Design a protein around this ligand. Structure first.
Ligand SMILES: [Cl-]
Ligand SMILES: [Cl-]
Ligand SMILES: [Cl-]
Ligand SMILES: [Cl-]
Ligand SMILES: [Cl-]
Ligand SMILES: [Cl-]
Ligand SMILES: [Cl-]
Ligand SMILES: [Cl-]
Ligand SMILES: [Cl-]
Ligand SMILES: [Cl-]
Ligand SMILES: [Cl-]
Ligand SMILES: [Cl-]
Lengths: 677, 677
């Protein structure tokens, strides 16, 4: 019955969890939440296999530099794991060694015949599964978390990872490269709140709860399995959108862009059903601390939503005045996966023949709100294809104040057109565009299409386009885009997805727009980052410009596969076996995250082929700028999953500095696998 | 007896503190710690008059945008105040309204005949004052603090503000524009630790203490008054420097650059005695939480120190191996204040005649270490003039690990030479310099001189240089530098100091250097920011380049004054009176901080003339880039101290959005005053 749809279940105890009825176990492990390296957090969604590591260690990664030197457990980095209810020592000492085992949650990776999703009631009642869908488990609506330095990450709200079966004010441990784990007083968990749906557009009522009553303010959820895929539509108006003909509507709601707790953004991809919340609030979440206290509407947190085209307000909108400004959404049951295609051109890109066209739009890439926070869309996701271009596509809600507003620091970023024959030859030509039609003519266009198969991306890490893996068919060739950085905020593209493969290269493939309806292209200090090749730097070590950039940029192919493709990781020097019933596509090294300018960066999902780079490189990417230059920089860092022998589990990490020939002895291996059908 | 040397004393109770014997009170108020606006913290040193505000409110500032609109208490910003021992409600409810009064510490601003400094024992014993100096009070060694989003700030370690008379695990309250204040579980205080001086170069011993024993790990201090000024020397070698002839040596130590707690840097200016710590440690501090628990060496914090010229290590230096790599320092008693003069030229700038020359060096501007953290030097401070140029002038110590190392992401930033006759005409010419002599020839030179008077800076906010205020003499004219941003990290120059007045303009007045001994100028994506003029943007709204930049840049004058100059702020629409015995220099508006790209920014000290801008402007500064462009941007924000009527004190801030004609009705006024002699 199984067809390659893989999810994780977490016990939150020392017990290894059983797979739900109708699904089969692939392997079990320890519940891995996120890493924090060079002050940057990078997580693995709890519903995906990347959150289940077979080998526990307080330091599951290492980092490498442009001098071809790697450092393991030798600086001041962190890892975080879901915990059990085991009580900590009374003297508040940390735990080390094998004594850690009773404290770490266990997990099991399961394969099912169809996708598993989470649905949330946003009340204290358990929501029903969508009609026809089968219940896998019930739980509590878990969103995000922060710990050291207020760094953290979150769950996609339609992922099973957003539905924890046991409520915990303190669901996770902070661990150090030093070998210790503990709970700390700034370790915070964030949950969807139980809301009054009649008060959507009214000021939140503050509440503080203590042990014995914490669950009275927490939303409930179910994880459900049903055939088909989820298609998400955002109207960008105050009217609910209608589903494509033949696709049943599962629910409607309000277009959630991101939530911000303790000044840390947690975004929902607009193409995923977690971006469609049935119950709006200026503050749809609460947070809890390790002292078994939860606070709702007691500090300074906020929310961000896609906006309608109602006229810009001159001052914050209060309570009921908010309603006409929030975009609506629908979640529809589709027979296959929808993807966005982008042209980097004024012309609308056609859907491949036999692929059903759903809508056409403009290429929406990323956004920044208050502070240095923001987020962005996956270019392979329909959430990157908005039917209506808007310089100001989103609003901010001031949480407790019960208002929303468009403040002047809001930026939207859009993929731009690129002249096909001028690639490399010239620097981006800066421009400032003040009229909406002028702007629309410089923005990349897109079309959302239903694909009969699955798309994966492969990167050659050379100047030659790679071949697709056995049994797949090349769709197009391109250039390996790793991430972009706009207004200092980094936003990545999953290297296993088509957004990491742009058909046209530019050092500045996007522009930004403000609430004054003025857009600026290549006119500030922004970046693009690309996987790179073995090409050595010039002896002068000056940045490359123009045609001299070409030999440095990795190429890629997007490949059409007949079945689902995943990556698995051994955490050893051995190649991990593909799960039974899956066939090998390629092998590689476990690539997890990266940072460069301002220590901003992004990372890979371990479940994705993008986490399995076929050639290890201490310096796998090059940094480009809107002014038309590219170079390597001394603070460009790569992060890799580490090997963990049985003797490395639980014990103090053996800190080490490794030079060139001895690097890959500590790098985990991986295999990219495709379900056999 | 008084001669214009002004400091603050804090009671940490509801009692208004008396001034120490031999000093006279100027006014009293409430103990103000820092603001957090647009996710950026900006503090007022607790030893300075900026930490004593007469009118308490939970929202003492507002912010303004490039559309000439200001917003007061309408977003999600914070203020922080020193607290009393008053107990909070049992249900953990926040406090609002007049009920806040018993919780806010009081302060008194005092004038004395000479400077007041803090000295720290780094033990549980009280240190003696330097020989001949008079004790003002005793206390506990307070460094820094973090709260929401792990934002916070710190005290200069030779400031009286680093010596709190009562130890408190929870010394401060977090307040909101909403009108609430409370303690939160992530509100952390950081203190110098009690250290074993025999274990300076050994691994820290971890400790966790609870109520009743917290002070057993906390350093003690005294605040002392003595005639003369402090001169700080850094050898950049493992040998202690010798004081200039005629200047008694007060102490020697190790060159502290910055400390990092919860991933937040707190820097010590290298020209201030807080950068010279007698007792080295890889972790010289501990932290406490509001649950009356303090932790030493239990997490992942670190320290940074100036380095010697010993050869670069291939792996971290462990314990005793550290010693030859840490720079030494001396603190000397000087008869007048020493300042740095910079040439922006290969030629050494001469000391003004009659000013005593102390040393010559290279212009050291800023630095970045792990993550997005770092700091920098005031160009008027001798700490910006290092005798030996070093691409890698500082090292990082990994705290608990008991190691130090030079990792590849470390950057040093140096002020560069500027061709006098090429200003404005051409964009900066990018260059990559790989040889030390080549680098030294592109770096600005400096000389440290003893000045017989005091220097202040005035900004015209027009294209004309301003006149110096009455009774002062112009030293030079220049361009108004507000701050720089390198590797995304912002670093400001106090607008009341000569570092905010550069004789030569460039959009890129600095370069950066890495541990591979390679320096890069105008070759990445860095910024400079300048006070601006009334010049309107071009209709195209494209960035300015070349000679078109000139009409946008504010000019300044540096002025020599016969006596100390301060600013005072009314928090009302009325001009504050100068203190008795002080004469008026100019009046203005209370300018506190600013942010632009990435919401990075800097701010002003309320004690400084730099916090008193003579013309209010919603958009007082323009953003320039290393590529040679300048423009205004929609996220360029200014922050101003707000007016607080008696009816605004304690009560809920009356949130308001203000347009152009009604802006200054909510802007505090100020006066710049000079001691009459
Ligand atoms: Cl580490
Ligand atoms: Cl803690
Ligand atoms: Cl809140
Ligand atoms: Cl604004
Ligand atoms: Cl740019
Ligand atoms: Cl570099
Ligand atoms: Cl506010
Ligand atoms: Cl809390
Ligand atoms: Cl620590
Ligand atoms: Cl490194
Ligand atoms: Cl630059
Ligand atoms: Cl802008």
């Amino acid at each position: 019955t199984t067809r390659g749809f893989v999810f994780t279940r977490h016990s939150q105890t020392t017990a290894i969890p059983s797979c739900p009825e109708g699904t089969v176990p692939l392997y079990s492990g320890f519940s891995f939440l996120f890493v924090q390296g060079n002050q940057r957090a990078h997580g693995q969604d709890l519903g995906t296999l990347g959150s289940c590591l077979q080998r526990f260690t307080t330091m599951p990664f290492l980092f490498c530099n442009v001098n071809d030197v790697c450092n393991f457990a030798s600086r001041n980095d962190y890892s975080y794991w879901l915990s059990t209810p085991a009580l900590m020592p009374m003297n508040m000492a940390p735990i080390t060694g094998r004594a850690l085992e009773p404290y770490i949650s266990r997990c099991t990776v399961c394969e099912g015949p169809a996708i598993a999703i989470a649905v949330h009631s946003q009340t204290t009642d358990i929501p029903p599964c969508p009609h026809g869908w089968i219940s896998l488990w019930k739980g509590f609506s878990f969103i995000m978390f922060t710990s050291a330095g207020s760094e953290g990450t979150g769950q996609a709200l339609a992922s099973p990872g957003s539905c924890l079966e046991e409520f915990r004010a303190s669901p996770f441990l902070e661990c150090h490269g030093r070998g210790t784990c503990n709970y700390y007083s700034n370790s915070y968990s964030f949950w969807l709140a139980s809301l009054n749906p009649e008060r959507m557009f009214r000021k939140p009522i503050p509440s503080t709860v203590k042990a014995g009553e914490l669950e009275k303010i927490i939303s409930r959820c179910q994880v459900c399995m049903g055939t088909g895929f989820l298609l998400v539509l955002h109207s960008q108006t105050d009217q609910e959108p209608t589903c494509p003909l033949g696709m049943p509507r599962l629910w409607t709601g309000y277009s959630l862009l991101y939530l911000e707790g303790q000044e840390k953004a947690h975004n929902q991809d607009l193409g995923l059903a977690g971006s469609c919340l049935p119950v709006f609030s200026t503050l749809p979440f609460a947070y809890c601390n390790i002292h078994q206290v939860c606070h709702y509407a007691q500090r300074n947190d906020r929310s961000y939503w896609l906006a309608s085209a109602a006229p810009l307000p001159m001052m914050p909108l209060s309570e009921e005045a908010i309603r006409p400004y929030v975009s609506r959404c629908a979640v529809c049951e589709a027979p296959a996966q929808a993807v966005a295609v982008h042209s980097q051109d004024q012309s609308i890109p056609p859907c491949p023949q036999t692929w059903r066209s759903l809508w056409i739009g403009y290429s929406f890439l990323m956004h920044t709100g208050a502070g240095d926070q923001g987020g962005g869309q996956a270019l392979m996701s329909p959430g990157s294809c908005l039917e209506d271009f808007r310089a100001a596509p989103f609003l901010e809600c001031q949480g407790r104040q019960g208002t929303c507003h468009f403040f002047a620091n809001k930026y939207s970023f859009w993929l731009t057109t690129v002249k096909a024959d001028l690639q490399f030859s010239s620097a981006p030509a800066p421009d400032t565009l003040k009229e909406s039609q002028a702007q629309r003519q410089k923005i990349s266009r897109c079309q959302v299409c239903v694909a009969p198969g699955f798309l994966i991306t492969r990167h050659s890490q050379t100047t030659d386009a790679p071949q697709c893996p056995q049994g797949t068919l090349q769709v197009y060739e391109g250039f390996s885009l790793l991430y972009v950085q706009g207004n200092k905020r980094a936003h990545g593209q999953d290297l296993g997805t088509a957004g990491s493969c742009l058909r046209r290269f530019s050092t500045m493939p996007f522009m930004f727009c403000n609430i004054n309806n003025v857009c600026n292209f290549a006119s500030r200090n922004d970046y693009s980052y690309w996987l790179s090749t073995p090409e050595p730097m010039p002896m002068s070590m000056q940045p490359l410009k123009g045609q001299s950039i070409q030999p440095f940029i990795s190429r890629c192919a997007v490949c059409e596969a007949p079945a689902v493709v995943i990556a698995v990781h051994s955490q050893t020097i051995q190649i991990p076996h593909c799960p039974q019933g899956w066939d090998s596509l390629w092998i590689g090294y476990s690539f997890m995250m990266h940072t460069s300018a301002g220590a901003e960066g992004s990372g890979q999902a371990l479940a994705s082929p993008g986490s399995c780079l076929e050639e290890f490189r201490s310096a796998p990417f090059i940094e480009c700028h809107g002014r038309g230059t590219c170079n390597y920089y001394a603070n460009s860092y790569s992060f890799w999953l580490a090997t963990v022998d049985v003797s490395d589990m639980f014990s103090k990490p053996q800190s080490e500095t490794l030079k060139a020939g001895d690097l890959r002895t500590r790098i985990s291996r991986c295999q990219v696998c495709m379900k056999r059908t």
